[PDB]
C-alpha cells in the first residue's frame, strides 16, 4: 500500500498524463490505489462498495468553488478511506475507573503474549499508575519466560505459575494480588487448545464469566487478514465491548484485509503497533492512519513539541528575572538534543512530511537524523562557557574536543558554522 | 576517428602503463576517451548544504584520448579499420590481419 500513498503527490501534478483528458488521472489512481489494496491482502466484495460510493458522490457534487477539484477529490477519497476502515468512533482506551481487568483473549499465540508488553509498557509511561501482568496461558511453553523478560527489563513486575496448566485460579490468583497491593491496571493474555474458534471463545467463556473483566480484547496478526474477520466477528457477539488490535504490521505484508475485515463487522480496534520493539504499538483512529496520506502522520505531534521547547526557555526562569540581564547560556543548542533521545527526541517527526510549503531536497531529513548524534559527541566534550561564547573556537581549543570526543577534526569545523550561520540566517528578523 | 563501440580491450602504447586492457572508452568526435588505463586522486571541497561529498576520488573521466591500440586475440597493436562488402555498410567494421569483431 505504502507506495500508493505516493499516488498522493504522484497526483499533485498539473502536467497530467497523455490523455488530454487527464480525466483519467482519477480512475487510474482509483484502480491504481484500488490495486495496491487487494494485492495487499484486502478483501474485495466490499471494495466494489467503496469504489462505488466513491463514484456515487462525483455525479452528485462538486468542490465548493474557490478550490481546485483535484484536491476535494481527496477529502472524499480520504473521507471514505476512513469509513472504508475503522469509520468513526474514537476508541476509548483509557480508565473507566480503576483499577482494571484486561482480559486478553488470543487465538493461537502470535502477539499472543508480546503485545501485552508495549501495551502495559505503554500505560506505565502514562498515569502514576500501577500496571501488573500475568501469564494467562498454559498450553504453549515460554509463558512468563520470553515475556518474563521485559517485565523487569521495563520495571514492571508480573506473575505466573511454572508448568502449572490451569487458567482461572492462577488468573483469579494473580488479579487480586496487585489489587491487594492496590495497583492500577492489569493485563492478562490468555488462549486455549481447542481446535475450533468457537472453542477458543468457548474457553474465554468461563475465563470471562468467572472473573468479571471490564475491558476485553482479542488480537490477531494481519498474517491471517480479512480471513480473521469471522474469528473476531463471532465474539463481537460474545462481547460487543470486545475491542481489539492487529498483531504485527511490519509483521506480514497483507495488512489491509486484516484491519479491513475487522471494521466490516462493527469490529472495534484501538491500536496496531508495527511489530517488534517494546513501543512500536500505537493508538489508533483511521484518519490517524489514514494521516500521512494513507495512515501515520505525526508532526503535528513532533510539531507541537516546538511549543514544548519554544515557550519553555520561558523554562529556566520565565522570566526567572523579567528582562534583559543575560541570565542563561546558549548551549540549548545541544540542549535540544537531550530531550529528544532522552524521551522523545526520537526523530520528532522530522520526515519533511510534504515538503511543504517549500520542497527543497533528499539529505535534509533524508541525510542527518540517523546520525545527528555526532553533533552531540562534543558539547559534553566541552566546558559550559564554551557554548555561550560559540566564538572562541580556536583551532587549538577544540581539536581536543575533536579527539577528546573522538572525532577527527574536520567533522567539527565542519559544523561550527551550521551554528554560527543557523543564527545568521535564523536571526534574520527584518 | 572513433575506435570503439560497446567495448574495446585496448592496450597502452604509452601513458604510465604497458598494456592494461580496459573498457568504457567512449572515444568520438567532440567528447572524450576514458578507460582504466589511467586514474588519479584528489577530492573536491564540499561545503555542507547536504554533504554533497559522497567521498572517494579516483578516476572520473581520466584523460588519454585516441591513439590507443585495441584488443587482439594475440599480442597487441593490430590497427583496425579495413572495410567489408555489405555487412551493414554503416561502417567499415573489419580488422587487420584476420578478424573483424571481438
Amino acid at each position: 500500500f505504502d507506495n500508493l500513498t505516493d499516488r498522493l503527490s504522484r497526483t499533485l501534478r498539473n502536467i497530467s498524463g497523455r490523455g488530454r483528458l487527464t480525466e483519467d488521472n482519477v480512475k487510474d489512481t482509483l484502480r491504481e490505489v484500488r490495486m495496491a489494496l487487494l494485492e495487499a491482502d484486502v478483501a474485495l466484495p466490499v471494495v466494489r462498495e467503496f469504489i462505488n460510493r466513491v463514484k456515487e458522490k462525483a455525479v452528485g457534487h462538486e468542490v465548493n468553488k474557490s478550490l481546485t477539484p483535484g484536491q476535494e477529490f481527496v477529502k472524499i477519497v480520504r473521507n471514505e478511506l476512513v469509513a472504508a476502515m475503522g469509520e468513526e468512533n474514537q476508541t476509548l482506551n483509557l480508565a473507566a475507573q480503576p483499577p482494571a481487568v484486561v482480559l486478553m483473549a488470543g487465538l493461537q499465540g502470535a502477539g499472543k503474549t508480546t503485545s501485552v508488553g508495549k501495551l502495559g509498557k505503554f500505560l506505565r509511561e502514562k498515569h502514576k499508575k500501577k500496571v501488573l501482568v500475568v501469564s494467562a496461558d498454559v498450553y504453549r511453553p515460554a509463558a512468563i519466560k520470553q515475556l518474563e523478560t521485559l517485565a523487569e527489563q521495563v520495571g514492571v513486575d508480573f506473575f505466573p505459575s511454572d508448568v502449572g496448566q490451569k487458567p482461572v485460579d492462577i488468573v483469579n490468583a494473580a488479579l487480586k494480588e496487585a489489587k491487594l497491593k492496590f495497583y492500577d491496571v492489569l493485563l492478562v493474555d490468555t488462549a486455549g487448545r481447542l481446535h475450533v474458534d468457537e472453542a477458543m471463545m468457548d474457553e474465554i467463556k468461563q475465563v470471562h464469566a468467572s472473573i468479571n473483566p471490564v475491558e476485553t480484547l482479542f488480537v490477531v496478526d494481519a498474517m491471517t487478514g480479512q480471513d480473521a474477520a469471522n474469528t473476531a466477528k463471532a465474539f463481537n457477539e460474545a462481547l460487543p465491548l470486545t475491542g481489539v488490535v492487529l498483531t504485527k504490521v511490519d509483521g506480514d505484508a497483507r495488512g489491509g484485509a486484516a484491519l479491513s475485515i475487522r471494521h466490516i463487522t462493527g469490529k472495534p480496534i484501538k491500536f496496531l503497533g508495527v511489530g517488534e520493539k517494546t513501543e512500536a504499538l500505537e493508538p489508533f483512529h483511521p484518519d490517524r492512519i489514514a494521516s500521512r496520506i494513507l495512515g501515520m502522520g505525526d508532526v503535528l505531534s513532533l510539531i507541537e513539541d516546538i511549543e514544548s521547547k519554544v515557550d519553555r526557555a520561558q523554562a529556566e526562569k520565565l522570566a526567572s528575572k523579567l528582562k534583559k540581564g543575560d541570565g542563561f547560556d546558549l548551549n540549548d543548542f545541544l540542549e535540544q538534543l537531550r530531550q529528544m533521545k532522552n524521551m522523545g527526541g526520537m526523530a520528532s517527526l522530522m520526515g519533511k512530511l510534504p515538503g511543504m510549503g517549500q520542497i527543497p531536497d533528499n539529505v535534509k531529513s533524508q541525510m542527518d537524523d540517523k546520525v545527528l548524534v555526532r553533533m552531540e559527541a562534543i558539547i559534553n566534550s566541552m566546558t559550559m562557557k564554551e557554548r555561550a561564547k560559540p566564538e572562541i573556537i580556536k583551532g587549538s581549543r577544540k581539536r581536543r574536543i575533536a579527539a577528546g570526543c573522538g572525532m577527527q577534526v574536520q567533522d567539527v569545523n565542519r559544523l561550527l558554522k551550521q551554528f554560527d550561520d543557523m543564527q545568521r540566517m535564523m536571526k534574520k528578523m527584518k | 576517428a572513433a575506435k570503439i563501440r560497446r567495448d574495446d580491450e585496448v592496450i597502452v602504447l604509452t601513458g604510465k602503463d604497458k598494456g592494461k586492457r580496459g573498457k568504457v572508452k567512449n572515444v568520438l568526435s567532440s567528447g572524450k576517451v576514458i578507460v582504466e588505463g589511467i586514474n588519479l586522486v584528489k577530492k573536491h571541497q564540499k561545503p555542507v548544504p547536504a554533504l554533497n561529498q559522497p567521498g572517494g576520488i579516483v578516476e572520473k573521466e581520466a584523460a588519454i584520448q585516441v591513439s590507443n591500440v585495441a584488443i587482439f586475440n594475440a599480442a597487441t597493436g593490430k590497427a583496425d579499420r579495413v572495410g567489408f562488402r555489405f555487412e551493414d555498410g554503416k561502417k567499415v567494421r573489419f580488422f587487420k590481419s584476420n578478424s573483424e569483431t571481438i
Binding site: 508532526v299 513532533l302 510539531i303 507541537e304 513539541d305 516546538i306 511549543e307 519554544v310 543548542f333 535540544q336 522530522m350 519533511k352 539529505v363 535534509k364 531529513s365 541525510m367 542527518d368 545527528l372 555526532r374 553533533m375 559527541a377 562534543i378 570526543c405 572525532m407 574536520q410 567533522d411 567539527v412 565542519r414 559544523l415 561550527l416 558554522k417 551550521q418 551554528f419 550561520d421 543557523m422 540566517m425 535564523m426 | 555542507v48 548544504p49 547536504a50 554533504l51
Partner: peptide
C-alpha cells in the same frame, strides 16, 4: 511559529556536521 522554529532547528542540526 512551529514551522520556522522547527525548520531552523532542523536545518541547523543537518548543516553542522559535529
Amino acid at each position: 511559529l512551529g514551522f520556522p522554529i522547527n525548520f531552523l532547528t532542523l536545518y541547523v542540526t543537518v548543516q553542522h556536521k559535529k
